[PDB]
Amino acid sequence: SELDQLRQEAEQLKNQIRDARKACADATLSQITNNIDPVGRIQMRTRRTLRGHLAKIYAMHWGTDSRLLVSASQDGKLIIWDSYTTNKVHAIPLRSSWVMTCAYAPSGNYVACGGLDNICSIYNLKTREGNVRVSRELAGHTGYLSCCRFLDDNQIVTSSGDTTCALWDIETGQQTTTFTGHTGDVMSLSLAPDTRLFVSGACDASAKLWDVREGMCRQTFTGHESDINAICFFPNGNAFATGSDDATCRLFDLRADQELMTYSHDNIICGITSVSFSKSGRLLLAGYDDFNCNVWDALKADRAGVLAGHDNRVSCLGVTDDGMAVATGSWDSFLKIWN
Amino acid sequence: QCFYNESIAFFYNRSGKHLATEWNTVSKLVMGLGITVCIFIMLANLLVMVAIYVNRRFHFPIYYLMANLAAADFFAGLAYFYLMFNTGPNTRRLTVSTWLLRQGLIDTSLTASVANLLAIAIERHITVFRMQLHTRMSNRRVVVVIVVIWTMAIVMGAIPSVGWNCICDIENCSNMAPLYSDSYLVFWAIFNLVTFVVMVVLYAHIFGYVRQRTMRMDTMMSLLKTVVIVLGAFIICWTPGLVLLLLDVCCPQCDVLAYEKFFLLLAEFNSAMNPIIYSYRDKEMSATFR
Amino acid sequence: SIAQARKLVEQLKMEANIDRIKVSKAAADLMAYCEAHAKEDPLLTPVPASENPFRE
Amino acid sequence: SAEDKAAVERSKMIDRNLREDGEKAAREVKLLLLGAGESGKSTIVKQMKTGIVETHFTFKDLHFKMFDVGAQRSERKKWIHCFEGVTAIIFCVALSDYDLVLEMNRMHESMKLFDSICNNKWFTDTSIILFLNKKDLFEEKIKKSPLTICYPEYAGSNTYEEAAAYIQCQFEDLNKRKDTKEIYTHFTCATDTKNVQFVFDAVTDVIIKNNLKDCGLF
Ligand SMILES: CCCCCCCC/C=C/CCCCCCCC(=O)OC[C@@H](O)COP(=O)(O)O
């Protein structure tokens, strides 16, 4: 009868963990940083619209250049656009038409994707004298590929519906490391600025911080009542925001090890599909199933704008590494740039 | 060798038509029934147009054709309204130019309506035979054939407004439209007839195709009802008028001055019925009405 | 069975002992970093049209 | 501005290529194959000829892409919406397992999955083709086992036709959008080699009905 007694040992561990999390709760951000009045209303106008997809758009991602972006559509295509001249720079036909994630390889030379194929396809864009061709195919995940981000030019972090994450080495093609601990489908992941830690959000209403080098889980964060669909790091690197299907965003702090603040409006009750910060971290943008994207003041949790240019579910949202604009993509088969 | 000096009096005296010195029971009767049918036409077509331009679900080629037909029927209703207040004794005050203008308005409105019916039939036939599920639609062919429709209507209404009139042929002048000529009546009648029979053949092919490709797997009853009523409205509204025109141009000493205004009222009742015949099936269109 | 709970407890005991800081200090550092970079954010302060490649 | 305008045409070329692909992608039927694992879908895939498997096959100047996702093993609520817009859903069910249990009889699990898929908010206008496989096995099984193992309310003789029709109705009753979608049932035949023909007829019916609905003919 050691299983139940270890369960109760964990119960007591959680009791004292909650006690310590309350003991460090000397005050709240709302009480502290109220001296600064609201920053004011923000309004961004659609400065571009990218057409060419003949089906739903399921994901996008910005390149470090701040000029090129990628998008994957259910029509079986992966398009690399340039947001300045709105000219389709690349259009890759995939072997499987069911894709759900993208990644642009900050190096700027590779891209990746995956989906119901349970495979992470890596496409090289060198194209010496021939069209873009699949450079590699990482296999081993037993569930759909929900998210993937190039940790380097030869390493890639992937999240799968099989409730685990994996660090792969592209050249060799094996799971260099595996991250377990999530009890639900890992839906999103976010890398830290230094690439030494990353936060993953799953359908078990939990977010987990993972060390890439060590391979263990450092801290667990809870507070959501439903599945976490998105997660983003705070620019400083000591906090992160999580968006869930419970119509709410939540900002957690690493050092505090507790829920720092919340961002929810009684008017919005739909699910959150994407989240992001501004280069300064003040503005928190969140894409919704309401066909619109909402802006929030991170420090005070007050709506400060709305983006409405899509006729269907806004599936993906992103902010460039310069913070000059924002990219939104929805099931209406169109993308849009703001500001 | 033509006469553009004498006024409507001489032309009406040429044939057996009368000038209706002043008001009469028949005059008030026709004016009232006409303005009634015009009110109904305008109200129904305005309702259909606002319904199509309010709900965004009605943003497809077939609904574009339905709205175009609604606009054509509204135009015809206003043209018949303008025809009233000028016929009867008022016709005595009209001149050649205004006479031709009135008649051309009537002709172009009704021809636009008929062409819109034919175009709706053609688009239905095209849509029924595609072997795709969704078939994302564009805005090219719909507007193409729409402008072609309005062009055909305008040309058929303007041809007699310039050169094709019995002004230059006193011997051959109609008996219902004293200034028009028999050739134009024959032309319009043949056009209406060929359009109707073409619609009949198109809908019959649709029905046969659906019957053959559904038997192996009720749709047939509803399709037959829709087709039969769509064709019956047109036939029972237009056949008497075409018969009257043909009798006028073919049979001399045929009494046609008695059944002309009522047949025109029926031809306009066709446009009165058009909006509901092509919109009552779609319960969404009915719900949008309020 | 019991091995799962054992590994979970072993990994959670590391979370139990962790460098916890007062929420006050965390909020202070957050506000400091947020107001320090407030000038470099284009979205925070809408920039004129000639400075943004998306205007024209 | 010498080559800055050149790439444009290249871009445009890509664009037009996409269009053509789109056209081709629109000229093929899309079927989603679903079942409870041992539903006999392997037999169907064979008669038509880890991750997601695709089966292409042509018949009477028509093309079909059948997608089998039986090897997912994840919460279906996350990826099911990816199949919104398929022409039809071919749902397989083995009649033989009406008595054998996985606890829970596999027939009840099949009915639960069918209720979830048919009444799903993402599948409201998509038709379902129900394939009741294992005809002769179920026929020779019920000659000694009653149908009262799965449905305790059944009443009648234990023979093939009656019980087969009973299960057909019990599966058809789960439908709630009785006015938006249909359910084309067919007990799979082995030697007749007409299952592809039944799928063809069902898809043709669905296409023609959606066509009539596009215009004001229905
Ligand atoms: C007889 C029903 C013909 C229906 C014609 C539909 C429109 C096509 C017209 C083709 C030219 C021949 C039309 C001959 C009938 C005249 C129709 C018309 O619009 O004139 C009204 C006329 O009464 C008024 O007579 P007055 O009261 O004496 O001025």
Side-chain angles (χ1 to χ4, degrees), chain A residues 10 13 17 20 22-25 27-31 33-36 38-42 44 46-106 108-125 130-170 172-212 214-260 262-323 325-339, chain B residues 1-2 4 7-21 23-24 26-27 29-38 40-42 44-45 47-49 51 53-55 58 60-92 94-135 138-139 141-150 152-170 172-214 216-220 222-252 254-282 285-289, chain C residues 3 5 7 9 11-12 14 16-21 23-24 26-38 40-54 56, chain D residues 1-2 4 6-11 14-37 39-45 47-60 62-72 74-101 103 105-143 145-190 193 195-218:
Chain A
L13 195 65
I17 273 176
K22 184 173 184 176
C24 85
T28 61
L29 189 70
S30 267
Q31 173 173 224
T33 76
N34 162 265
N35 186 358
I36 185 174
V39 65
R41 308 301 308 283
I42 301 291
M44 300 167 280
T46 297
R47 301 291 162 81
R48 211 147 273 99
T49 182
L50 328 179
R51 315 177 187 273
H53 273 313
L54 311 178
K56 304 178 176 182
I57 290 161
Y58 268 93
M60 59 79 59
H61 183 229
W62 275 110
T64 306
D65 310 324
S66 325
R67 180 163 176 266
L68 284 163
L69 74 101
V70 202
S71 65
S73 175
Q74 194 58 262
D75 57 17
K77 297 280 167 162
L78 184 74
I79 297 178
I80 314 181
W81 324 73
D82 175 12
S83 83
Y84 289 7
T85 84
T86 185
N87 300 133
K88 286 184 279 290
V89 179
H90 278 101
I92 311 176
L94 310 170
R95 291 179 182 176
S96 189
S97 313
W98 321 95
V99 53
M100 297 190 301
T101 172
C102 312
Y104 199 54
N109 322 118
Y110 297 91
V111 291
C113 58
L116 296 178
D117 60 347
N118 296 6
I119 301 286
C120 186
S121 53
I122 312 297
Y123 297 79
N124 187 336
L125 301 176
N131 281 116
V132 164
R133 292 178 293 92
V134 56
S135 152
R136 187 57 56 89
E137 289 164 325
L138 314 169
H141 271 305
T142 74
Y144 58 79
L145 186 66
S146 59
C147 188
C148 60
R149 290 281 179 273
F150 286 79
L151 192 141
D152 205 77
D153 196 8
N154 199 83
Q155 295 177 336
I156 186 164
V157 180
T158 47
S159 65
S160 209
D162 63 61
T163 75
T164 67
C165 293
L167 176 68
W168 308 72
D169 172 293
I170 304 302
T172 78
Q174 304 83 28
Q175 290 182 332
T176 298
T177 309
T178 185
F179 305 86
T180 67
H182 269 288
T183 71
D185 303 2
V186 188
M187 299 308 307
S188 194
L189 72 100
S190 182
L191 289 161
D194 264 359
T195 69
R196 297 168 64 84
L197 316 158
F198 76 89
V199 294
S200 72
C203 289
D204 65 341
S206 172
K208 284 191 170 57
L209 179 67
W210 312 87
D211 189 329
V212 167
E214 261 312 280
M216 298 290 99
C217 185
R218 288 288 187 78
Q219 307 176 7
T220 306
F221 309 95
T222 54
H224 274 287
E225 289 89 10
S226 295
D227 314 332
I228 298 174
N229 297 11
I231 187 168
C232 199
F233 256 107
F234 191 83
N236 184 20
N238 316 134
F240 68 95
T242 64
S244 160
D245 280 334
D246 61 0
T248 286
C249 291
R250 298 177 190 270
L251 176 80
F252 304 80
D253 175 289
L254 266 57
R255 284 198 285 276
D257 194 274
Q258 75 93 28
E259 185 175 8
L260 192 67
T262 314
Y263 313 81
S264 58
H265 206 248
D266 305 337
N267 180 262
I268 297 267
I269 54 169
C270 66
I272 305 187
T273 63
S274 299
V275 303
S276 198
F277 280 99
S278 74
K279 188 160 181 174
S280 167
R282 189 71 179 277
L283 305 184
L284 175 76
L285 291 77
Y288 287 78
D289 295 324
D290 266 328
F291 301 2
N292 312 291
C293 159
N294 298 7
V295 185
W296 305 81
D297 185 310
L299 290 178
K300 278 188 161 174
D302 283 329
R303 316 214 309 180
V306 169
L307 289 59
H310 287 290
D311 289 345
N312 211 333
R313 178 178 301 200
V314 157
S315 61
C316 38
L317 166 95
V319 177
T320 66
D321 287 335
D322 199 11
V326 185
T328 66
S330 95
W331 284 357
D332 63 356
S333 71
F334 303 105
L335 290 110
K336 287 187 168 72
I337 307 293
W338 305 79
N339 210 100
Chain B
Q1 173 42 279
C2 332
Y4 270 108
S7 64
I8 306 323
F10 165 88
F11 289 103
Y12 275 51
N13 289 331
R14 175 61 64 186
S15 87
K17 215 169 184 178
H18 187 231
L19 273 297
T21 307
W23 287 121
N24 187 19
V26 66
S27 324
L29 191 76
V30 297
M31 177 171 287
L33 303 169
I35 53 95
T36 312
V37 184
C38 306
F40 198 54
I41 291 159
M42 286 176 284
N45 283 287
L47 178 57
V48 169
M49 290 214 78
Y53 291 169
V54 162
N55 290 33
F58 313 147
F60 301 86
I62 200 74
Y63 284 104
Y64 304 161
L65 286 177
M66 287 175 56
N68 189 20
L69 178 72
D73 288 328
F74 176 79
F75 179 29
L78 268 157
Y80 201 56
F81 191 87
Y82 168 50
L83 175 52
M84 304 296 98
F85 307 156
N86 302 297
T87 35
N90 292 24
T91 206
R92 193 265 299 171
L94 287 176
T95 57
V96 183
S97 57
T98 54
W99 193 102
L100 289 150
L101 168 63
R102 210 180 58 178
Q103 278 279 349
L105 281 162
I106 289 284
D107 308 326
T108 187
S109 66
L110 288 174
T111 310
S113 204
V114 169
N116 267 270
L117 287 175
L118 176 54
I120 288 169
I122 284 167
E123 177 162 310
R124 280 178 163 169
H125 181 276
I126 292 297
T127 291
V128 162
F129 274 65
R130 70 181 58 165
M131 289 298 294
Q132 290 178 8
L133 197 75
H134 287 130
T135 318
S138 82
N139 290 348
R141 185 164 54 183
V142 61
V143 305
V144 164
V145 284
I146 281 162
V147 302
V148 169
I149 282 162
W150 280 111
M152 191 202 311
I154 291 285
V155 66
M156 183 123 67
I159 284 274
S161 313
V162 175
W164 212 359
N165 52 37
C166 83
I167 301 170
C168 295
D169 289 345
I170 286 167
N172 303 334
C173 280
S174 170
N175 296 319
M176 292 184 296
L179 274 289
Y180 279 16
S181 178
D182 303 324
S183 49
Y184 178 78
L185 313 190
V186 169
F187 192 60
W188 209 84
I190 293 163
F191 156 85
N192 205 276
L193 195 77
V194 299
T195 290
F196 172 70
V197 303
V198 163
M199 289 167 51
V200 168
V201 171
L202 289 174
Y203 281 100
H205 188 190
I206 283 171
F207 182 89
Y209 181 84
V210 167
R211 194 172 55 77
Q212 197 181 26
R213 283 177 90 96
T214 304
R216 191 136 53 96
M217 204 69 254
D218 188 76
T219 60
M220 307 314 308
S222 273
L223 201 64
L224 184 70
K225 282 187 167 66
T226 300
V227 169
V228 63
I229 67 96
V230 156
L231 299 176
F234 191 108
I235 199 169
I236 71 191
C237 270
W238 283 109
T239 305
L242 302 162
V243 169
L244 206 72
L245 292 164
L246 296 162
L247 287 173
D248 183 5
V249 304
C250 303
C251 163
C254 263
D255 190 321
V256 307
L257 316 190
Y259 322 104
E260 83 187 40
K261 294 187 169 59
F262 295 78
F263 288 12
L264 187 58
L265 193 70
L266 196 68
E268 301 281 357
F269 189 65
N270 188 312
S271 66
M273 290 193 301
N274 278 339
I276 62 174
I277 288 284
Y278 285 79
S279 298
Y280 83 111
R281 168 172 286 275
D282 280 17
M285 193 70 68
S286 208
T288 301
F289 295 154
Chain C
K7 181 181 238 300
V9 166
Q11 186 269 320
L12 183 63
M14 183 248 272
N17 296 346
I18 188 63
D19 174 286
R20 283 188 173 87
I21 304 298
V23 170
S24 155
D29 319 318
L30 191 75
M31 181 181 64
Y33 184 93
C34 192
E35 67 88 6
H37 295 253
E40 307 177 1
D41 193 0
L43 297 182
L44 199 72
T45 63
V47 191
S50 64
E51 288 288 354
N52 302 29
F54 315 92
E56 64 283 331
Chain D
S1 164
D4 313 301
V8 180
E9 42 162 27
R10 179 163 179 277
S11 154
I14 296 163
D15 206 321
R16 62 180 295 275
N17 260 21
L18 299 170
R19 189 184 53 72
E20 279 200 359
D21 293 348
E23 181 248 24
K24 191 176 284 296
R27 204 199 297 276
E28 58 197 358
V29 182
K30 284 199 292 181
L31 315 158
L32 173 60
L33 193 64
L34 283 160
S39 43
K41 61 203 308 195
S42 64
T43 297
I44 293 299
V45 170
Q47 287 151 341
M48 286 281 151
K49 302 177 175 181
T50 178
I52 182 169
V53 189
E54 310 184 8
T55 315
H56 296 44
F57 68 92
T58 191
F59 189 79
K60 293 179 77 181
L62 209 54
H63 288 87
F64 309 87
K65 261 174 167 179
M66 204 181 300
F67 309 102
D68 171 54
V69 292
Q72 254 302 339
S74 301
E75 180 40 280
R76 178 177 61 266
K77 188 259 164 183
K78 304 307 304 187
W79 54 260
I80 192 65
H81 59 78
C82 296
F83 291 107
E84 188 191 29
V86 297
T87 296
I89 296 171
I90 295 172
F91 193 90
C92 273
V93 173
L95 300 181
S96 45
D97 61 17
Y98 83 101
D99 61 335
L100 317 184
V101 308
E103 296 177 20
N105 60 81
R106 295 201 283 278
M107 183 63 77
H108 276 195
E109 196 75 279
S110 310
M111 286 205 308
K112 283 183 178 297
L113 175 53
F114 188 87
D115 180 69
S116 298
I117 294 294
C118 179
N119 303 129
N120 198 269
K121 57 157 173 173
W122 299 111
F123 304 130
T124 45
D125 53 338
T126 66
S127 292
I128 307 182
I129 301 167
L130 192 68
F131 267 120
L132 302 162
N133 305 326
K134 312 303 192 67
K135 183 173 66 174
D136 282 68
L137 173 54
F138 160 80
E139 165 159 341
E140 201 265 7
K141 274 184 71 169
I142 62 180
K143 285 193 179 299
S145 181
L147 190 67
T148 52
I149 296 297
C150 182
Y151 308 86
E153 66 277 16
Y154 175 81
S157 57
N158 312 265
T159 80
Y160 165 60
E161 287 96 89
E162 288 187 349
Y166 190 69
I167 290 160
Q168 176 174 351
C169 309
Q170 282 289 321
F171 260 85
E172 279 188 335
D173 292 338
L174 297 176
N175 191 16
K176 293 167 183 171
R177 292 86 164 91
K178 290 276 195 170
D179 53 356
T180 323
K181 62 170 70 173
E182 292 200 337
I183 295 170
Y184 310 82
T185 302
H186 183 201
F187 292 72
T188 293
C189 40
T193 66
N195 302 310
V196 188
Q197 191 154 9
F198 189 97
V199 171
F200 173 82
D201 298 349
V203 172
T204 300
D205 177 274
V206 164
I207 291 164
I208 283 173
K209 289 187 173 178
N210 287 274
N211 277 337
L212 295 165
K213 228 157 196 301
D214 296 338
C215 55
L217 290 172
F218 188 68

